[PDB]
Design a protein around this motif. Structure first.
Motif, mmCIF file in Angstrom:
data_model
loop_
_atom_site.group_PDB
_atom_site.id
_atom_site.type_symbol
_atom_site.label_atom_id
_atom_site.label_comp_id
_atom_site.label_asym_id
_atom_site.label_seq_id
_atom_site.Cartn_x
_atom_site.Cartn_y
_atom_site.Cartn_z
ATOM 1 N N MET A 91 0.867 -1.215 0.000
ATOM 2 C CA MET A 91 0.000 0.000 0.000
ATOM 3 C C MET A 91 0.887 1.243 0.000
ATOM 4 N N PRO A 92 0.611 2.259 -0.838
ATOM 5 C CA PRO A 92 1.522 3.388 -0.973
ATOM 6 C C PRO A 92 1.282 4.410 0.121
ATOM 7 N N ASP A 93 0.372 4.091 1.030
ATOM 8 C CA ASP A 93 0.042 5.017 2.133
ATOM 9 C C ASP A 93 0.609 4.372 3.381
ATOM 10 N N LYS A 94 0.312 3.090 3.636
ATOM 11 C CA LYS A 94 0.712 2.405 4.904
ATOM 12 C C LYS A 94 2.180 2.647 5.261
ATOM 13 N N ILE A 95 2.432 3.450 6.298
ATOM 14 C CA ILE A 95 3.822 3.717 6.770
ATOM 15 C C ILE A 95 4.053 2.817 7.984
ATOM 16 N N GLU A 96 5.006 1.887 7.910
ATOM 17 C CA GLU A 96 5.210 0.915 9.020
ATOM 18 C C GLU A 96 5.715 1.555 10.324
ATOM 19 N N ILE A 97 6.735 2.418 10.287
ATOM 20 C CA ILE A 97 7.282 3.127 11.496
ATOM 21 C C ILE A 97 7.827 2.185 12.580
ATOM 22 N N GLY A 98 9.142 2.160 12.766
ATOM 23 C CA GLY A 98 9.723 1.371 13.867
ATOM 24 C C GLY A 98 10.104 2.284 15.025
ATOM 25 N N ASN A 106 14.046 -0.370 7.534
ATOM 26 C CA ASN A 106 13.077 -0.866 8.547
ATOM 27 C C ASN A 106 12.836 0.120 9.694
ATOM 28 N N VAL A 107 13.835 0.903 10.112
ATOM 29 C CA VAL A 107 13.601 1.774 11.306
ATOM 30 C C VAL A 107 12.430 2.726 11.015
ATOM 31 N N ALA A 108 12.306 3.266 9.797
ATOM 32 C CA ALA A 108 11.096 4.044 9.432
ATOM 33 C C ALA A 108 10.780 3.753 7.962
ATOM 34 N N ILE A 109 9.696 3.026 7.662
ATOM 35 C CA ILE A 109 9.437 2.614 6.247
ATOM 36 C C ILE A 109 8.266 3.400 5.663
ATOM 37 N N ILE A 110 8.538 4.239 4.666
ATOM 38 C CA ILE A 110 7.492 5.110 4.066
ATOM 39 C C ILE A 110 7.490 4.840 2.558
ATOM 40 N N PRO A 111 6.571 4.058 1.925
ATOM 41 C CA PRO A 111 6.697 3.794 0.496
ATOM 42 C C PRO A 111 6.528 5.120 -0.242
ATOM 43 N N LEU A 117 5.796 10.714 -0.269
ATOM 44 C CA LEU A 117 5.366 10.611 1.146
ATOM 45 C C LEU A 117 6.580 10.782 2.062
#
Lengths: 25, 102, 98, 66
Positions: B95-102, D39-44, D48
């Motif tokens: 998804m081009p919106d879903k930002i995972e964020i660790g 992985n620490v911050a993943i923004i496709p 964005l």
RNA sequence: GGGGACGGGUGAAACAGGAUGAUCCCGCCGAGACCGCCGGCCGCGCAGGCGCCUGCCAAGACCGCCUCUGUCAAUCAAGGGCGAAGGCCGGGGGCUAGAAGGCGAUCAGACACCACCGUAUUCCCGGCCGUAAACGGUGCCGCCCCGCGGCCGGCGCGCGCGUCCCGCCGGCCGCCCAGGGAAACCGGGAGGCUCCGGGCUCUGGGGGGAGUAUGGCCGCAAGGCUGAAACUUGAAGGCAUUGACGGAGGGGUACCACCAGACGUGGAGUCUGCGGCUCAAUCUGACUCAACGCGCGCACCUCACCAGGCCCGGACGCGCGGAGGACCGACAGCCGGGCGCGCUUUCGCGAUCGCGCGGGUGGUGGUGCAUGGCCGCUCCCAGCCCGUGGCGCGAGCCGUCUGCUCCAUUGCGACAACGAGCGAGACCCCGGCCGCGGGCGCCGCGGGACGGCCCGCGGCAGCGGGAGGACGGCGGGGCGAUAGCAGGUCUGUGAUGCCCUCAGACGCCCUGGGCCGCACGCGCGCUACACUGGCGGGGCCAGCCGGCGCCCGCCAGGACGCGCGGAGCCCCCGCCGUGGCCGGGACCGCGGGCUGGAACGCCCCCGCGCACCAGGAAUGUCUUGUAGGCGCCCGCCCCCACCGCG
């Protein structure tokens, strides 16, 4: 005012009826 | 599968949740079933049954959301069943919106 | 249901109030229910006040004010936007706003 | 002008909650480089990822005064 | 008295009024009402009610008290008095409004609302009447009952001390914790009540019939007070909650709104569609936005319509028929546009079948108001939900907010909400710029731009400005929520229910005609009205993405070849010279060609040179590579674009 207008209609029937009873006494 | 159970005279909402559960078991985020036609009445109404989130806009609709229309010819006239499944995750694009964020 | 405790009128410890007429409609309205906004304006508009003030040959005379109590009937007041229909929440507010 | 949306906004806080020293107060490229560490911050999408970084730069600028 | 043409009236008007001088202004005068502004969460009264100024008369509640009496009390049928307005009676009065009446405008009709004139009435005195949403829709006397106010009339306390302050009693009130209630709400009760009993009166018992009938009493009457039944009926009603509407109040927003501008249309000729008209037929849908160059080019086909004419291409299944003979073919002549269609004739032909009954297949037939599907539209918007908690007995609300920000339910801020989702955005496509790798041909992948930075102003989201940079603050598109709507389509389909026409056919073919007919009214356009132009030659130039050669022909085109190529506006020089003129090319008389089976289609050439000299009420679209101006390509197509998409 349908209640006020019903009372007036009732009155103009009762006066007619009172006149009719007076013809026969 | 929906077209078969509808010609088997099953209550529509019963069957629609059965199709929804067969995609819910499969891991789809949501499934939307729309049955439109003379469903028992001369007037036509569209009975939309849905479960879980579905998306409808942009390019991820062409990729993530699958759709299927069947013109099941019921006796009274012809009904139309539309099954739509939304699989949020596939091996390739995400998804081009879903930002995972660790 | 009863919309207002006041009943739309300010009658307290009385059975009758003096009738007044709407300035616009001419409907007889008991004094308590009339809108009653007093206005103190100027005899001429501000746009003409400057030119009239320059015209006067008197030493120090201001444009003299006009005082009138406009009393309006409920319908005349809502149509001419003197008062507005408010929500059950704001209906209680009594302080003059704006 | 351009008004940040809730994804471009909530993630920016989540980045300043997790990382403090790595981003700097007026550093878009650095704020874009920290936010781009896989992985620490993943923004496709860079679009964005760039927008997130700009909001992080603004949030980082706000925190440094107070 | 003055002075001079209209005045009234309204939403706009119109009937009234005005040189008999109105309206208007002033100077006066008569009459009758009426008591303004002050005038109220003021007060008083038993309620109805009560407001000029003076004088008079009798009262009344409250308060203060070491005054008197000693229960003298509470509520109350019967009984008495009072009682808004309207009405009635006998007089007075008669200004203003004004039930009736009449009238002008309305509207289909209003006789109504609105304007005008106006009788009863309004007002007074003497009687009647006895009714009001006579309300706080809440009887009366008594008790305790929680704070915080305001006002009002007494009284007392404090203080130096002022209409101060704190109380007390009585009245009017607001807000309200409990408490109650079906809630609304009430809390100076509707509290102290299923835990139900301080005292007294009144009234109700589903909705109507009906406050009627009848009897009574009362009134001058109008009518009041009392007051049924037969009969009919499954609800009527209370208060809340979602929506749906409103010809309601606010906020917000958009060049399908406006502003500021643009370029228009509506005015002319034509092009095309729409109505009407006319027809053998002018096949039809579609009629505000959201019908009308719309269902992507009608000589034929298309084609559904008309005038004719073939043909079974009626499958399968049964009863019968038929093989020396089921079924259809045919030369020639007639008839017929023409067809062995029929007819004369006498030849073929080979079970692919006839006939009866069933039972089909097909139909651009109907019904989109039986439907699927797909588009339009609300929506060139910004809503739509959920989990957990809070508040409700619940339906439920809150979240999802009357503040700010945005392009945006886009975010901030406040806040019983707190987090999520869908839609918005992100994404996808193309573009400008940098790089990488490749290169019959510029075409694959990566960067880059984020309100980042800076200065203001802001808690803030952001709100203007400044650069730097191809690029700047939603670049030019695709996609599109939740719900919808009797939008449109059965005539796009082997999408479809139902009537299914079904053989002298609504099937399916062929010919001829129409769909293009035109007293007319309209929509989208095109070309104009010229000198910022027409007319001649000279440069030169694109992009979607792109063929040409040669010869003959003024041309339009044709023959024969090969493998390949490109606008106008504009510019430069002449010319016309304000003339309906060389502005304009509409109509029409020859021709020469093209494409086809066939023009009626188109092209060209020489005439012929209509209106129109800038368009009335109105109405449209538009913010930078924009409007406009200018050409080109494709779509559909035998031919052909004033159209659409680019």
């Amino acid at each position: 005012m349908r209640a006020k207008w019903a009372k007036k209609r009732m009155r103009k029937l009762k006066r007619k009826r009172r006149h009719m009873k007076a013809r026969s006494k | 599968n929906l077209r078969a159970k509808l010609e088997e005279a099953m209550p529509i909402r019963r069957a629609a949740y059965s199709i929804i559960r067969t995609a819910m078991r499969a891991g789809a985020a949501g499934c939307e079933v729309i049955v439109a036609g003379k469903l028992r009445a001369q007037r036509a109404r569209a009975n939309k049954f849905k479960e879980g989130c579905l998306i409808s806009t942009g390019h991820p609709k062409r990729i993530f959301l699958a759709e299927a229309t069947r013109h099941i010819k019921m006796r009274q006239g012809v009904i139309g069943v539309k099954v739509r499944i939304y699989n949020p995750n596939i091996r390739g694009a995400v998804m081009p919106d879903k930002i995972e964020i660790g | 249901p009863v919309k207002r405790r006041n009943n739309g009128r300010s009658k307290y410890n009385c059975g009758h109030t003096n009738i007044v007429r709407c300035q616009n409609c001419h409907r007889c309205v008991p004094k308590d229910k009339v809108i009653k906004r007093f206005t103190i304006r100027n005899i001429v508009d501000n746009t003409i006040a400057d030119d009239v003030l320059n015209a006067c040959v008197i030493q120090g005379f201001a444009i003299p004010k006009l005082y009138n109590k406009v009393q309006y009937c409920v319908s005349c007041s809502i149509h001419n936007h003197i008062v507005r229909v408010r929500s059950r929440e704001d209906r209680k507010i009594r302080t003059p706003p704006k | 002008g351009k008004v940040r949306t809730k994804t471009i906004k909530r993630a920016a806080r989540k980045i300043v909650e997790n990382n403090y020293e790595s981003l700097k107060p007026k550093d878009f490229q650095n704020n874009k480089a920290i936010c781009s560490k896989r992985n620490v911050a993943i923004i496709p999408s860079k679009r964005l990822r760039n927008k997130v970084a700009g909001y992080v730069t603004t949030l980082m600028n706000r925190v440094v005064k107070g």
